[PDB]
Amino acid sequence: KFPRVKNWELGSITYDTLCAQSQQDGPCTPRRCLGSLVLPRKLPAEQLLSQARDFINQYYSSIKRSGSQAHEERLQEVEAEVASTGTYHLRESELVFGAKQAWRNAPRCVGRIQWGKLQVFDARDCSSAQEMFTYICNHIKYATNRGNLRSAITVFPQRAPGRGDFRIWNSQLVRYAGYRQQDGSVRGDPANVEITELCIQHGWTPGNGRFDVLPLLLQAPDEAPELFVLPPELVLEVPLEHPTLEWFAALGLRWYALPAVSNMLLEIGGLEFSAAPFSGWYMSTEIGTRNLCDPHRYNILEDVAVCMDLDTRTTSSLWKDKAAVEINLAVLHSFQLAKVTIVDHHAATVSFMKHLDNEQKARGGCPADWAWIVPPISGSLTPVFHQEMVNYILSPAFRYQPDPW
Amino acid sequence: GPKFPRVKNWELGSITYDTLCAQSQQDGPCTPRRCLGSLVLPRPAEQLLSQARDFINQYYSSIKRSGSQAHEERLQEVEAEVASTGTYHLRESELVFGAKQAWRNAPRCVGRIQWGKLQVFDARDCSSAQEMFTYICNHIKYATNRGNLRSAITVFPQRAPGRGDFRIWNSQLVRYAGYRQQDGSVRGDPANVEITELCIQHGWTPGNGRFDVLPLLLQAPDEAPELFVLPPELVLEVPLEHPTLEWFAALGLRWYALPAVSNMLLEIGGLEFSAAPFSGWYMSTEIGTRNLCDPHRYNILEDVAVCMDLDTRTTSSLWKDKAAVEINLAVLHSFQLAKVTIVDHHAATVSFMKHLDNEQKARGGCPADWAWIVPPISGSLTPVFHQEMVNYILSPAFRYQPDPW
Ligand code: HEM
Ligand code: HEM
Ligand SMILES: Cc1ccnc(CCCCCO[C@H]2CNC[C@H]2Cc2cc(C)cc(N)n2)c1
Ligand SMILES: Cc1ccnc(CCCCCO[C@H]2CNC[C@H]2Cc2cc(C)cc(N)n2)c1
Ligand SMILES: C[C@H](O)[C@H](O)[C@H]1CNc2nc(N)[nH]c(=O)c2N1
Ligand SMILES: C[C@H](O)[C@H](O)[C@H]1CNc2nc(N)[nH]c(=O)c2N1
Ligand SMILES: [Zn+2]
Fold this sequence. Notes:
The first copy, chain A, has helices at 45-62, 69-85, 92-104, 129-144, 193-201, 284-293, 301-307, 319-337, 345-363, 370-373, and strands at residues 4-6, 13-15, 119-122, 152-155, 167-168, 178-180, 186-188, 216-219, 226-228, 237-239, 254-256, 260-261, 265-268, 271-273, 278-279, 397-399.
């Protein structure tokens, strides 16, 4: 009736009962599993009222004031506001609780042990792209904290029935340019070709390097996006070198300290926050393995292998595996040297097992997407490989949304 | 778009639609509410007839005689036989076709580019445990072929009306003993503790090494199972050494050549072959990553990292990743030196991508279990990591079944 969940390394079993709290359908059916898909195909008063009620219930329960006078009266306010206006507004503490919960509920995040520690900036009094820019700079400054990174989210004004959304066009707050060449190849980050071209077209003067930090395209409702250059001093970067391989630094590779996602929608109690960028810190495999070694990213494996004089002629010398390990080591080494927060995939997955255990006792379950939780190198060397996981959508939630153009 | 799952490759940017999933007649464990794709384990007159009719239609399509006189005569023959006996029997060529199709349909197999090349040993005349042993030995000789391995399956009599099943008790034809020690530790393969203890219960005199080959426990209908020692000359093994680390040979590690699953049930047109062991050749990660490095298997990572002089006190030295690469390289190198067929995870996943493309054209999709297809080291370094996959159950199929004890 409820899934039995087993860890195959330790032989232990739990039962997920939290999944019964889901009211939002994923992509799978009994005929076929679509759990490996990156995006869903997918991309009213009575229904808003019930999501609103359920969330306010979640909130008064968390502060143990469930059933109290304040609880009853808050349910009255939400109802009164919805019945008259078709929408409502959260109190700041509710917002803070909802933001933490959305992160707690995020199935693709291996960093959730940290979920209770989140600085929430209320930017709902934002009324212009210029104001968005100031809030975003304050966030970057707070979060970066000279390398001692602190989790944060900034929440811009919710979507409203009448008008366009507040949006940040960039997928992250820091992104390196990707310049398409005559010969179809890319200079810089192939993942950002399209945003790079949008920036240029809205007036940005492009450089010509592999690691040019992009400007931000910020959009206030029903207005053209505006371009804002991040002051170079706010964007902490880490030059990559290797503990033992001297030539590695001569690759001139680097990455930014702050992973801040800015294209996801935050849904809390039926309300939708179309711009609500959040940041934590990197797990090294995001940089070392994916951003640098994906064939459709910086694609440096071969280059590194040749520098290592590895036998490139044949897959069976495991040249790819050997080069990837060294690149992941260089990332860890460099971030440690620069005193910038980072976590390796072993430490991260161990803390996630602890999180799974915490959540079992607290909530009777934890929604997790095995394909995203298990790291991109050394999967079975981490405890999460051997752990069964149930994936489902709880609300508050972070969600994908269409690109504004 | 088409009303079938859309399937994307994120490396190449290419898109397909899976129409083959419509042919699924059996539910997996997922629902709209929660994905359970990461679970290792899942869970007749009128029913049999339709399963039979379906398989016969499959057979006649595969030979392009769909709707033909022979086709309608076979259908009639099948229902008459079911009508008077409650069961029916496959023609030889139907068995060969059904076995290949069960392999082709197996979502957890990365080796399926080879599916059309299977030697099908028909053993449906077998009537004793002694004869099972002869068949199995012949299978082992043929499949091993002095290290030039050839895929094969031997099929024993199907399940019958209230009569007992043919079963091989061992989970594989080759398994190393796992001896529980006084201190609670295990000498040998911890995977095989239960089967080892069953062997001793049935009169096997145990050894005391890390790599003692187990005897087979074989069961003819309604008989206690009988014990048979494999003649050592039939069991090809590869001593493990490393191409540059000279001390690696001194570890005395080894693995057997022939991976041969013996506990699975082969289902064809409603008929159930409870003993139908099949074999191919290893992908190297199966030995060097899982069998040697799993914490609950030989668990050699630390020992090898110490020999390599790694810093095992901190996760961030990537000592685990480095040791695993070398163990994997030692597996590849040693199999190559010994002239025993093996495939590395790069070559294997490349060939699985070719298989995906052949099957798109031939059948409009391919059922695939992403968590199983992606190798347990170097995941995103292989092309399959970036390939979305649709998982569903087609028949003919290999299924898990209860242990006979
Ligand atoms: C505290 C440090 C954190 C670490 C080490 C971490 C770790 C990770 C990793 C490795 C991923 C997968 C990224 C990828 O493969 O591209 C991820 C995804 C994600 N994380 Fe975290 N996380 C952290 C904090 C946060 C915070 C503060 C939030 C929100 C408040 C968050 C919410 C999410 C969401 C929604 C995803 C999925 C992103 C997507 O689908 O594009 N995480 N996390
Ligand atoms: C030809 C060489 C082959 C290679 C390299 C290969 C590769 C593999 C690998 C790596 C696995 C996963 C094993 C694990 O993680 O423990 C697997 C599973 C599987 N393969 Fe193959 N395969 C081959 C041939 C075959 C053959 C001949 C058959 C049957 C006719 C077969 C059917 C299966 C099935 C049913 C599974 C799932 C086993 C289970 O769930 O226990 N494969 N294959
Ligand atoms: C807070 C935090 C901590 C550690 N890392 C990060 C960065 C996460 C980057 C996730 C980017 O995901 C992109 C690129 N690869 C899969 C794809 C999934 C996706 C698709 C869409 C439409 C939006 C989105 N945010 N994510 C953020
Ligand atoms: C033909 C071939 C080619 C390459 N490799 C192989 C070996 C496959 C061995 C798979 C063993 O599976 C076991 C051990 N790990 C997960 C678990 C799944 C499982 C469970 C059960 C009850 C039966 C079974 N056959 N498989 C076979
Ligand atoms: C197709 C497949 O689902 C896709 O490659 C996923 C696999 N697992 C992942 N896991 C994480 N953390 N991030 C990713 O981008 C991906 N990509
Ligand atoms: C819990 C998880 O499903 C389990 O550890 C799976 C993951 N992927 C796998 N993939 C393969 N090929 N073989 C396995 O045994 C497993 N184990
Ligand atoms: Zn699923």
